[PDB]
């Protein structure tokens, strides 16, 4: 009864603390002796070199699961995709903890990727809830020309159509254009006054500047913005009244990995008595056969549900993504993020803090605006 766990982390202190967490999880009652083994590796700067090294070290060490987090440089993309494909060749379940990008959601590409961090697309599920409390019916969407943006748009459209409702319009823009003034100008000639933005940080800053120069930040407008489009340089150009989303302890890698190691240990314990067990391939070289128990391990991981983690309950969606995540709805006051509302799933609960709106208005505006200029 020997099961090894691979780790692809950023800093050595995290490696030591997660090794300590694995040592704690070794006994945890029930388990016997040395059923768990801990292995770790750093983030190799080159993607091809990283993909080679993860197979040369982790796969060669008989890892049942691989733990991978965000790179130590958040500004750089540095996606863990190279480590997802290789372990996906042998159906090895990789576990992401801080990769919020909505590319791994489609499991046709990443066959054995599971993440406990909700993606940006799930943020769309929050937005409809924001429409319920404030009675938003007419609304417009801005989406960057990216797979993540398209997935978020599809999720929002499906959730709105579930209530037999349609948004006013959706504007698609390429990730990097500067002359976005035409899109905002043509969006101004609409009844809806609330815009949902889904783009990159630079695109968010460009849209903020365009709105500022086109007097679109006045009273009446509502700006519902996600996590990626408020942080960083966006705060340089974000006007007051932004209703931004944030992930509670989403950037906290330590808590996410401490919950993930326990979830993986519980899944291994459940799997070691389910049915016939086939060992994972010893090495990447000289083995072109997929792991027979890989899909079963993935199903066990997706079916697992434990609230013992410090981040609250842990539940996986039908596609293997985080479900019922704690979101924080912040209202930008004096360019300062203030926690205004909480979202523990299903419903969103506000607090006693009053919500300000763009243009200095302290009263909730109305999305409907009868222009009376009927062409």
């Amino acid at each position, epitope marked *: 009864k020997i099961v090894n766990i691979g780790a692809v982390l950023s800093t050595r202190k995290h490696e030591q603390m997660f090794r*300590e967490a694995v040592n*704690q999880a*070794n*006994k945890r*009652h029930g388990s016997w002796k040395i059923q768990l083994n801990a292995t770790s590796v750093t983030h190799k700067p080159n993607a091809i070199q990283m993909a080679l090294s993860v197979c040369e070290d982790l796969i060669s060490s008989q890892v049942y699961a691989i733990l991978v987090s965000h790179p130590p440089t958040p500004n750089d993309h540095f996606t863990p995709t190279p480590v997802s494909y290789t372990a996906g060749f042998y159906r090895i379940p990789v576990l992401g903890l801080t990769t919020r990008m909505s590319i791994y959601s489609d499991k046709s590409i990443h066959l054995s990727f599971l993440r406990t961090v909700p993606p940006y697309s799930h943020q769309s599920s929050v937005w409809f809830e924001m429409m319920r409390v404030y009675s938003w019916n007419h609304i417009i969407l801005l989406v960057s020309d990216d797979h993540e943006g398209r997935a978020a748009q599809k999720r929002l459209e499906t959730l709105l159509e579930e209530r037999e409702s349609k948004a006013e319009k959706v504007l698609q823009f390429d990730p990097g254009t500067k002359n976005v003034t035409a899109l905002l100008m043509e969006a101004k000639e609409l009844e809806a006054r609330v815009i949902i933005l889904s783009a990159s940080e630079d695109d968010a800053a460009t849209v903020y500047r365009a709105a500022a120069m086109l007097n679109m930040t006045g009273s009446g407008y509502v700006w519902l913005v996600g996590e990626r489009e408020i942080s960083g340089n966006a705060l340089r150009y974000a006007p007051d009244g932004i209703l931004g989303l944030q992930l509670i302890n989403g950037k906290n890698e330590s808590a996410h990995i401490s919950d993930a190691v326990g979830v993986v240990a519980q899944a291994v314990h459940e799997l070691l008595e389910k049915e016939n067990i086939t060992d994972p391939p010893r090495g990447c070289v000289g083995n072109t056969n997929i792991w027979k128990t890989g899909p079963l391990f993935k199903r066990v991981l997706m079916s697992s549900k434990y609230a013992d983690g410090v981040t609250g309950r842990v539940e996986f969606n039908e596609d293997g993504d985080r479900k019922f995540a704690n979101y924080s709805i912040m209202n930008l006051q004096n360019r300062k993020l203030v926690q205004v509302g909480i979202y523990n799933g299903t419903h969103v609960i506000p607090n006693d803090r009053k919500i300000i709106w763009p243009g200095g208005e302290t009263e909730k505006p109305r999305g409907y605006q009868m222009s009376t200029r009927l062409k």
Partner: antibody
Amino acid sequence: QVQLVQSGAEVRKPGASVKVSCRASGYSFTGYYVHWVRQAPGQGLEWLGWINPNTGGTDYSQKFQGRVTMTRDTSITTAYVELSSLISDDTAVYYCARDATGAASSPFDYWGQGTLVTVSS
Amino acid sequence: DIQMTQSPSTLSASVGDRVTITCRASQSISSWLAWYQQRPGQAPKLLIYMASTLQTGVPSRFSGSGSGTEFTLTISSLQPDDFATYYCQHYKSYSFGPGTKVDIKR
């Protein structure tokens, strides 16, 4: 030298809640697991559970799951165990012990004096 | 869970008499057994770890041996401090044995 100071003996009525504190000194509190173990009079040792102050994770025995709670205070380096729904069988002597972090071969190197909890009418 | 059986349960011997304690587990536990000595009104004291190496500072009279499921503790000359209960515990299961104590013959 590892020093552990426990509270005095307590008498509680059945159905109430009891809290026992154990102050640790002379060693790195965060770098060692704190284990709670109870012993009935004239009976074998009954392992309650353990807690790691560094991470805050707690492990409880299956018998006491759902009623036992373990907390740690790093500011004063003190462990606390709270037990609810007390029964007559809970009358026992509780001990806090130290365990090395990352080592699974040195169980309970040091033992405390112990605190007696009596549940009777 | 691993069940520990100790023989004899209570040995009514005298001072200096050879004391042999045999502890058997339900299943194979390799060598993950710990021998502790406990006195009435006092906390147990560790004597042997890993079922083969005595704790540092323990008297040389104690001798621990065995493997698999069967382990043995031998005392050549029992002293006044040796009149105490002995427990064999499995670390991987945290299961303690019934306890072998030396009683005064009457």
